[model samples]
Target: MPRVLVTGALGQIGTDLSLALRDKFGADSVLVSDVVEPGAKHPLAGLKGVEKLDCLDSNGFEKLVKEFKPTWMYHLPAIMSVRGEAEPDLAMDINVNTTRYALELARKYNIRIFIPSTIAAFGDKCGKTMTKDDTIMNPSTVYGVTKVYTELLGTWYRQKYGVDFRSVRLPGIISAATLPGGGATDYAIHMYHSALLQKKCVCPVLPYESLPMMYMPDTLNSLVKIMEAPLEKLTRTVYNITGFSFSPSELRFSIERCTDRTIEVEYVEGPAQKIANSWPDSLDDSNARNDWGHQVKYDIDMMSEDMLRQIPILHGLPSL
Candidate 1:
């Protein structure tokens, strides 16, 4: 059985992804690793669970890589948006330093590494729509800069060192399974929680700030699809994953339609709002579509229905 390793295994995506990978490959086949412990909020508590890993220190991460000899490396750990802004140095260290270390490990062990990139790679300069795979990636935030560099590093390793690397530029990922980390689009996840818990939400971002987003299931599926794609067919080294676009008020409307609750949504001034305003409203992922048969199934309505019902019940929020 080939071994699989997932970094940041306790994060919002990692918690769900680790279990799915375990189920597909077998419990022991997947080695779950994170800088932090799996929280009580994690969906599964008592299974052969994840191990602690600190990717910043090259020597320690490499030791584990040698031990496991993982065939596939899922690199998802990072310092998110707001934190990246406040503590730029730490963000750069974690995002840039860890990625380089992962690439080196992949090179040394001859492992295929999969990394998740974000739309944050683009800034206000990129147009509202049809942001192609190859465009001006002038990222304003430290988080975006790190991601941009990560992609370049992946490309460089692939070309220079013959290390097989794959990456996807993700849109906002919304899920009821876990609370989102610090990011501009966190308001999308937070609104649902607030609606069910307090019957109201004081949204931090502006009402009209629209951004591309996808559900957790699709997000995970896309990652799997890209990593599994045939090398011959993958023309583009990095691909864009376009998803549903919704403004703050539009999301609130969807929740209202489903639950019949006039959810109080107030837009408060915050830094995330400014960050979001600079992002593209939507994207053209036709290159990804052609390359790997990429397609998104869930739209806002389908996603909204699932979130309103599941999230409230799972979290023990107030709901009739």
Candidate 2:
């Protein structure tokens, strides 16, 4: 079994990915770490291999690496778009610096690394373009700017130090397990709660501001699929991957169908809307599919059906 280490294990992706990793690689083989402690209610609170990790602390980071001696590293720490724009300095420091730290440590320890890039890497100019694996990356947001650095840095490490670095530009990942960590796409999750609990929703972005999105299950599966892919089969350090794309109006339609009730909705232009305008409406993930045989199990309607079904269960409400 591969000894795997994941940073940012308390974040949205980490909560689910940690458990999935443990299951796939064996419970004892995966080490989950983050700066904050998991609450008792958190699923990984009592996990045996859990620890506190501050990715910015070089000495402590290296110490953990030396001690655990992980064969694989998944560096998932980063400030996302909505919050990153508000705190650009913090985003720059945590997102880019921590990635540099990961590359250096992975190089020294001879460990393979997976760093995630984002669809935000493309700028407003290409927001509507069918973004390919390799495109002109002129990201408009601070978060996207840092991810560009991440993709290039990973590639540089792979070429210069042979660090075996890998990455993929993921779309908006929607789930009900945990609240989204300040990403512009978080509106998708919030709308569900508002519609279900209050019978009304005030969306943060405009109705027509479209972006690519993926459900949590497909998102987690994609991570494992890419990481487990053989080195020889991979051609790029970062590949664009997506599930589906839709506007708020489209999602509202799905929600209405799923709930079987007319939910009142209001869409307004906001900071998140500006950020979404800088992201791709859709992605050309043919490279990812061609490289590693990527497959998505949930389309928009299927995911909507499940989200509506599961959210009610999560809220202790009877089925509709």
Candidate 3:
């Protein structure tokens, strides 16, 4: 059985990904770690193993790796876009330095590593639609700069050290289990929460400023599928994977159609708007599709319906 270690296992993607990994690899085989402790209701709270790990603390990370002896490592810790912009130095230390630590460990241990990159790796120069797997990476944000560095570093490690490093350029991820953090694409997740609470959502970007997004299910699926794919089939070190694309107004319409309440939205451009505008409205994930039989089950309507139905249950709110 493969032992898996996941860092930032309390975050949105990490929470779901850890659960999925535990289910697949066996609960005892998967060890989840994060900077902070998870609550009792947190998905990873009752898991077989949970550890407090600071990714930047190389000693702590190395100690955890030694204790777990994980054959596979999912490095999900990072300072996201908005937060990164607010604290660039801290972001670089966590995002860039921690990644270096993970890569070094992976190289030394000869373990398979999965790192997540984001659409933030692309910038305004990469065009607005169907951004290809290979494009100009001129990210304007510190978060994006670090992701680009990660992609390149992972590639270099693979080429020079023969470490089985894999990554995907993820779009805006929407999950019912966790609240949005300080990411540029967090509006997608925030809108659902606001709508379910029957509160008005203040969108930080223009209504027409579309960006790629994916539901939690697809996000988890992609992560597992890519890791399980045959080495010979992978054409690139990092692949772009997106489920759907939508704007604030379009998302509001979907939520309104799914819920009985008439959801309201107020658009006010913010710092996040500039970052979102630089990202691709859609992604060309042909590489992922062809390489690993990538398929998404939810579109805008389906995701909205599921989010509406599930968010209430997740929060213990009365069903609509």
Best by TM-score: 3
lDDT of 1 at 123: 92
User: Could you say which candidate leads in lDDT?
Assistant: 3
Model 2 TM-score, 2 decimals: 0.96
Better of 2 and 3 by TM-score: 3
Q: Over the stretch 220-247, how does candidate 1's per-residue lDDT look in tens digits?
A: 7887788778888899778889668899
How accurate locally, in lDDT, is each candidate?
Answer: 0.85, 0.88, 0.89
lDDT (Cα, 0-100) at 308 in candidate 1: 82
lDDT, candidate 2, equals: 0.88
> Candidate 1, clashing residue pairs?
none
Model 3: worst 10 consecutive residues (lDDT sum): 311-320
lDDT-wise, the better of 1 and 2 is 2
lDDT of 2 by residue, 1-320 (tens): 78999999888899889999998889989998999999887878887988998999989999999999999999999999999999999999999889999999999998989999999888866636678787678898999999999999889999998889988888999887667899989888887877778657877788988899999999889899888899999988888889999899998888888888777887767799988887889999998999998889998889888887777775554456
Ranking by lDDT: 3, 2, 1
Pairs in clash, predicted candidate 2: none
Error of 3 at 158 (Å): 0.5
Model 2 segments more than 4 A misplaced: 315-319
